[PDB]
Ligand binder design. Sequence first.
Ligand SMILES: *[C@@H]1O[C@H](CO)[C@@H](O[C@@H]2O[C@H](CO)[C@@H](O[C@@H]3O[C@H](CO)[C@@H](O)[C@H](O)[C@@H]3O)[C@H](O)[C@H]2NC(C)=O)[C@H](O)[C@H]1NC(C)=O
Ligand SMILES: *[C@@H]1O[C@H](CO)[C@@H](O)[C@H](O)[C@H]1NC(C)=O
Ligand SMILES: *[C@@H]1O[C@H](CO)[C@@H](O)[C@H](O)[C@H]1NC(C)=O
Lengths: 285, 283, 48
Amino acid sequence: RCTTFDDVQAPNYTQHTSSMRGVYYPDEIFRSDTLYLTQDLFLPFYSNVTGFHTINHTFGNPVIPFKDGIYFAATEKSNVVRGWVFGSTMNNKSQSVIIINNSTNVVIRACNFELCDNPFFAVSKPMGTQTHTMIFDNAFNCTFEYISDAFSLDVSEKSGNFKHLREFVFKNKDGFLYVYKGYQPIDVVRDLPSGFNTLKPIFKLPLGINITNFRAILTAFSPIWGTSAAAYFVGYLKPTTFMLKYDENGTITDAVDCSQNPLAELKCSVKSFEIDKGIYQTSNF
Amino acid sequence: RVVPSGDVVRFPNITNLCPFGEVFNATKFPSVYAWERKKISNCVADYSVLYNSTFFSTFKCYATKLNDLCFSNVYADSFVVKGDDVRQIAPGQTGVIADYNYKLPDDFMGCVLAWNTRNIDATSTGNYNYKYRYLRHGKLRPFERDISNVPFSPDGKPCTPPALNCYWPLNDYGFYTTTGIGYQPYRVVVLSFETVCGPKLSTDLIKNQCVNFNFNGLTGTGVLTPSSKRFQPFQQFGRDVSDFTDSVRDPKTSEILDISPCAFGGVSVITPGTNASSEVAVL
Amino acid sequence: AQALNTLVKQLSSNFGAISSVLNDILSRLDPPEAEVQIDRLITGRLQS
Ligand SMILES: *[C@@H]1O[C@H](CO)[C@@H](O[C@@H]2O[C@H](CO)[C@@H](O[C@@H]3O[C@H](CO)[C@@H](O)[C@H](O)[C@@H]3O)[C@H](O)[C@H]2NC(C)=O)[C@H](O)[C@H]1NC(C)=O
Ligand SMILES: *[C@@H]1O[C@H](CO)[C@@H](O)[C@H](O)[C@H]1NC(C)=O
Ligand SMILES: *[C@@H]1O[C@H](CO)[C@@H](O)[C@H](O)[C@H]1NC(C)=O
């Protein structure tokens, strides 16, 4: 049922420098003892991002631009951002995709949904279970439906520091939406932790919709619905050149963007982290 | 050169040549922007039934691309185009079918199968009830469907029909019986190529020999033996410090293998002279 | 090291063919689509 809230505020806009975010395995190629240079749709280093502090009245999910693909991050204590509407018009007017994790399954469909003006998870706050997926009411002219394998996530309101960091990357290619998953344990007071974390392929999704906007479905919390504490971001994937240092097991252990600063544009020419002292010809201007 | 000895055909579990009524048996095809999706999965298919029907007449693949099949699911896509828009059903090639109605993937490429429907799907006033997108605020990416049954804003501003100077997203084709071939309705099945495999059998792992091999996404000749490489579960195969694959996770039984090439090299001849002798020894 | 790797990386040059792979051009394309792009990659690699 398409319902609204009592108050929807704007986030705190707290700025942060994303240090080492967005890295994933592009391919299925194993390589080892190697150092590989590529461009793909990557989140760049040192990127200025904004902190969407969703706290108890603030509810940030308007039309947000996707345009090729996005990076997502979320330090989570209450596991709030667990859904995403993808599409163009964000109304019951074009074909859209509702990807939700409804605490039991990952439910993905590709239809012309009766899209509400408020994408939320109608979840009871003192216990953390979802009453209804109040994002659509029904669907029309579908092309896809899937339910994942079953597990359970505690999504009630929690206090303290953020214990869960989930890393998500969404991309449009050949019909196949590719959604990749990253995770680490954290103990987080403010905007984001610095550090390195990869992503791995999980989903290959022939959804077939014109993917030009996204509305990240949040989780509503009220025992008139509200929310609770979650720090989550929006980043943009750009066709930038990365180095991909592989260890002996084939784990991506480090990466270097070429387009940050003239130090790291030099690294992509030398193909190393170690660069001797001197002058090196790099590409023309 | 060492001439190889053996065949290595390794695949996950095998089904038969399945019948596909979505390929050659469907009678009415809907519009192209709302193109009907039916798929093909888990069948060793040749799509000889594209040729083998009395419902089609063109028989062309975009036709050596018919056997272009050892990959994921094929989508037999059902729609009626016009003769001037037969040309735009292509990987890329952004015309009024490809840019806004029906864009095709480009890893592998299937078959576009049209049929003469001058007498059934047309009329002498133009069977205008079939329509197509010609201009939309946003281009399709490959393998997408557009079911916007909506009066359209031609520039992104609130100008929707039935307001003045506000355009519809749908032109008429002009399916006339009184015109030539360029304006005829053509029932088109496209096999969108984006799990089936054409040459899909199962043979023995002829290890430690110069063999041939055909895998899930890997062909070639060489030497096969188990490997110790720490493959990730999301990693199909390995490559060397160069850029040809020398290690593979087995498509049938997941055993991590090595692929060395077959042995080869040069030949010398060591002779002491024809005046000296007539025997030689080769290196 | 350089003169081997430059000789290595010019294997992967398309030279106007649809790919730098002589067996895709062999197997995937038409036999008229093949010999057009076989004859490109040889003359490319020969003078490389
Ligand atoms: C790639 O991953 C493998 C795991 O599959 C790593 O092998 C394991 O690495 C650990 C840590 O180096 C080894 O543990 C060590 O054991 C010795 C022996 O008692 C001990 O003295 C050390 O304090 C440490 O606990 C483990 O033995 C080793 N596995 C085997 C079978 O030897 C490998 O290190 C990874 N590759 C790289 C480059 O790190
Ligand atoms: C990031 O952009 C915001 C604009 O809202 C700006 O206020 C902030 O200073 C920028 N960050 C840095 C480190 O300059
Ligand atoms: C063959 O070798 C002998 C060695 O002394 C030499 O005398 C002879 O002339 C040679 N044969 C010819 C045809 O020159």
